[PDB]
Design a protein around this ligand. Structure first.
Ligand SMILES: [Cl-]
Ligand SMILES: [Cl-]
Ligand SMILES: [Cl-]
Ligand SMILES: [Cl-]
Ligand SMILES: [Mg+2]
Ligand SMILES: [Mg+2]
Ligand SMILES: [Mg+2]
Ligand SMILES: [Mg+2]
Ligand SMILES: [Mg+2]
Ligand SMILES: [Mg+2]
Ligand SMILES: [Mg+2]
Ligand SMILES: [Mg+2]
Ligand SMILES: [Mg+2]
Ligand SMILES: [Mg+2]
Ligand SMILES: [Mg+2]
Lengths: 331, 331, 331, 331, 331
């Protein structure tokens, strides 16, 4: 549903999401020499991989299938509290370190331009033995470049173990926030136009909309930085002075992303005061126009009114040009 | 608000609340095999349970009955300073660890929609031997799902000891803040309508009212996070590498709740500036309308006035349509 | 008053106060069995008490008598730097722990309602041997309930030693901040009326006045929290696992008072923006009234003016009622 | 001027603005006797380096970089320190070297009525039995300290050179109280003009004061850190001797910081108070326009339809007093 | 030119910059005795210098030449992750310490006055053995004074080793921020003119522009302080109690720069509210002018209108001077 699933016992596997469309399993098992890869929708087929001596990346898509999550969960010996965190998708990103596995929760965003609105999808990962278990809400992810790298043997991914695969997955995900930040920079640039130039009713709507989107963004990003901070200065089954430099590089991007997001909160928050000033000033002009038209034709209509002749007209042009050369000392 | 109860000695048991309606004791004593449960209003009947070898949940409702709190207090060996903390309900949530008992104070909120106003109830808990003493201000709580779990033997609560009962009750209370958060989100959504759309006198009232409610909400939630932080990374008679994972899960929700509350403070604080801009932009129109009507009929009334003929009327139509085709360059 | 007392040597006893009215000494010496109490204005009479084996509370009122403070100071062996801190009354509250005495400086406030203005008095205390030396600026304090408790043997104060007397004195003073907070809450409640309802010139005065008063209040309360924090987690001649729980209870109120004060800063800071919005929105009405009256009687006065007949009056009523049934589509 | 770029680390440039005067001034003293003189020949003060009795060498006019160099080398002061002496745009600070303490402070001047504040840097070096002092321009706050050595007041003559350093820092810190007093006056004057004399130059002074307060805070906060460091640290500062004295300056330092925060806070609101005073006058100016408008608009119209007589005047007084008794329902 | 370079393996050397114009290498190898210096565009010629026993400063300009960076990188044994950080030009400044080298990334700014806009260039440094490798985007730097010092044997740079050269290069770069800060102080001084004096549409543009520039500036300066904080209290191959005092001096400038940047954020952020008030008040005055002209010539045009004689004119002068001596009680 949404943020209530109340009075249920601790271990209860409920998908609180909204995507119940697809379901797919996808394995990739690889070594320095060779690699295999397949999709199935039968779970019992991927369970043997728990015991590979070679890296495997099991990617379960469509976790609305709580049955499936439970089965994989029990088989790999994952705590029910963890499985529950997998299936509840309104949640702090986070990392927890257990005996024989690392658990990570991350968000993966989408921004629709022009209908200025942003959705997220939760991704969970579990490193354990030679496996990276991945859990997703819906088909469509940012991990495609990583598949190619295993498939077409690019980079060093094939030489390296399962922890480096975790790295590689996290790095693909963090990098995507750069795409997202670029799109948001464009809305900001568009919006600081309308503000001091197209003053309007729907212009104020979009400002607030962006501010709101930024707050949501900040809410994910700051714990995301903490995730990567934790992965970097910590380290159990992450082959150490080996992969640690790589986590640190993602940690760095994380810090960059956080900084850029603060920068936007900052720029945007002033934006309304810029609009307020653009409009109060458009008021000032309307006022001046009213006031000069008023200030000449008020006495002129008065002296023409005291009745009850080209010397009246002449006084009417004298006190009319001493107005206009007084609104040459302001206006 | 009874925020004063001054010049009384440290040990003094005064209920500073406002609920003096009901009174009830309710025991639930349980084990893996069987369970018993009853209500009474005679205190002497519950005191034997102090020495159970099996988990017990004594729940005393209506702590306006200071005499009752004193008796239970003294019998379980609870410090007078703690008993006074129980009866005084204007207070930081908190945890205090003593020799043979943990003491906890929490708040439990109620939001009345439409009459946009929020009340709270304090709940105190004392874990000690195999007991969870609970103290409440008035009938009606969030612990109902927990009773069913003991009654109908759901979950694992019956296999686990008194500390897990503590957990289970806190967990039930923390979860309720999610209900409350959802209701507040709705007011926020409703309010960012009226602000940029139904500009009004009572609209500004509700904004402030919400802001106020948010501040009160923040005041409780932040120390609440600290309560659950303390329970998690600490631990005396809380069967350790057993129940600790559970408190941690509540700790997490606490962090989520905190985060969500900052997000509302943030969104709402801007809401007045959104209103300001919605209104400064409106005034502008009333001004333009006044100014065009002014600016044509000011000189037209003047030249018609300098007379005190269809060539006058013709000049009056020429300088009237050169106005209207100049407010086609703005307005 | 006052505030500079420059280029004087370190040890210099100047009263920088403003109260030079009264002077009084008042002793209360007590034990489990019996108690004595008296007032004097002769100092040499109180000095023997330094060597009681029983708790004594010497209360010197009117420290403008720097001579007296010096005498008592030297006799109990109190550092001249401390005596100077006693007599200088613009000053962070604080605690300083010396060899054979604790020194404490606190403020004690008065809020005059209706003439919305707040004064304070400084109170100093020195625990040393079996004495609590108290120093005050002017007659009238909050310690009256404490006298009663010694006099009429209430509570446990008579069983306990001098440190518990210090506690009692501090506890009485902190509790008075509750009184003061309640009075401030009332001004806030009254002020958030005038803001969105009686918009006015003197209304803005009171807001600022209150904000100012709150800043002054925050300035004292935050270091007050630090005083009590320090007394609680520290402890020399404070009979330990005895009186510590009691300091801890004051510590708790201190935190509550701090929290409440932040809450007011928060609430009040928005209050001007509420007024701004209440006025920017009214201006609107005054504008519309001007604009309707303007917009009908501008052209009506023009056509009646083109003349220098019940078909003129009929056109004047037709275009007058097509206005009013157009301000039935707004206004 | 704070550019002096691409010069090697050791470069002695005076980046100040005061090149007027130059003077040396020694005061050497002991418990028994004291000598003091002025010179402008440096070689005369260098012998003092080896006193067994406290000396206070005060060099005024450090635009004389040659002099600073000579004293520097002779006392064995690192060129990096010497450069910090001559560069006057700089965080106040304390640096502890092998055989000396180095301290940099600011010393302010506020000119009332031309609401503007200048500073002068003071450096100090404690080393052996010397306190070297370096100033930009004649005129300092140290006069009371000279008298105390001259006229053997206080205890300065009994105590060593570290107590002299204290005495000098204490004199300088105290001066900030003078400066804070003067600033409190501007604040009190300004919160008049804001809600009472609304004006163009009123807004100027607000900003000006805000700016002054930011510069002030910039110096005061590191100043607190200087004194914090001197207090809880201590090498050649005769310990449980002079430590109490540094601590007392430390306290003033904290009081000064707290008072400055109080002003930042008070003043920051001050513009919103002005905004509200004006948006409201707007309201009044509006009402006045609107009543005058609303009666004399129709009255000028009916007198205009011609083209009756004390029956028109009577209708003109009726619809004129039904206005005024309608602006008895608002206004 | 973006910040997306997505789905590429960790080690990938892409120049994400925008300057592809020049390319140059420039070595300076020096010792106490003598020095050599040359430019080349052939890389293989500089590689031998890796093994100098004497300090060398290799400065590669035009890192768009990724091939060159790769070659120097591998030969000096620099990790591909660092190389990638060299070529990626959008990036937290930072320091990373590896086995046999220190890596540092810094920015180097340019402010164009009058077209109020600021660009930056990245500079990377690697201290390794007796080399400082420097990497730049485009010809033109701040390091010229440092070349002179080696060339014309000034300062102590020739006596000192490679770590002092690093210091010298970082010190040159940090110093330039003072130039940049001076230029920005000028815009602020100019802008707080236009705000309270030349109120205008393009005046608000520049304010925002400057705020934006400040935020970007702050983004670089803060991690910059962290860079130099890290170099100072850390230290591997930086000859310790030797060069550390020097890094500390840069550290200090860094702190100063940060403090100055906060000061500007602070000053500038209020600048819009100053403009708002300067304009709302130009509203207030325009209003008063309209309202006095209105308020006299409204009734005067009415009584001259009631028809249908020097006693009419006399009443018209009486009620015209009782207005003007009523706008001597306000206005
Ligand atoms: Cl790779
Ligand atoms: Cl359960
Ligand atoms: Cl008591
Ligand atoms: Cl050098
Ligand atoms: Mg749950
Ligand atoms: Mg009490
Ligand atoms: Mg969980
Ligand atoms: Mg605002
Ligand atoms: Mg003093
Ligand atoms: Mg308590
Ligand atoms: Mg330098
Ligand atoms: Mg320096
Ligand atoms: Mg003191
Ligand atoms: Mg990459
Ligand atoms: Mg990188």
């Amino acid at each position: 549903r949404l943020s209530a699933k109340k009075g249920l016992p601790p271990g209860t596997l409920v998908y609180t999401g909204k995507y119940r469309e697809d379901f797919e399993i996808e394995v990739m098992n690889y070594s320095i020499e060779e690699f295999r890869e397949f999709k199935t929708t039968d779970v019992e087929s991927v369970l043997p991989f728990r015991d590979s001596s070679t890296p495997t990346w099991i990617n379960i898509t469509g976790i609305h299938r709580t049955d499936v999550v439970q089965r994989v969960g029990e088989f790999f010996g994952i705590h029910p509290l963890v499985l529950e965190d997998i299936l509840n998708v309104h949640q702090r990103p986070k990392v927890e370190f257990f005996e024989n596995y690392v658990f990570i929760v991350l968000k993966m965003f989408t921004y629709d331009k022009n209908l200025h609105e942003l959705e997220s999808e939760q991704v969970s990962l579990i490193l354990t033995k030679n496996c990276v278990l991945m859990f997703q809400e819906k088909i469509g992810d940012v991990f495609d470049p990583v598949r190619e790298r295993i498939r077409y043997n690019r980079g060093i991914i094939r030489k390296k173990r399962a922890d480096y695969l975790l790295y590689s997955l996290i790095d693909a995900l963090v990098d995507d926030y750069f795409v997202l930040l670029e799109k948001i920079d464009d809305e900001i640039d568009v919006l600081e136009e309308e503000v001091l130039e197209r003053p309007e009713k729907e212009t104020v709507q979009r400002t607030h909309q962006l501010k709101r989107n930024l707050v949501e963004l900040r809410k994910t990003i700051w714990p995301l930085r903490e995730v990567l901070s934790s992965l970097y200065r910590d380290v159990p089954p992450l082959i150490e002075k080996e992969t640690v430099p790589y986590f640190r590089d993602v940690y760095d991007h994380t810090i960059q992303i956080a900084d850029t997001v603060e920068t936007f909160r900052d720029i945007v928050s002033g934006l309304l005061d810029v609009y307020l000033s653009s409009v109060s000033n458009k008021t000032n002009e309307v006022m001046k126009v009213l006031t000069i038209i008023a200030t000449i034709f008020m006495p002129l209509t008065f002296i023409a009114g005291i009745y009850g002749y080209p010397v009246v007209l002449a006084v009417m042009g004298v006190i009319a040009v001493i107005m206009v050369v007084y609104f040459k000392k302001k206006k």
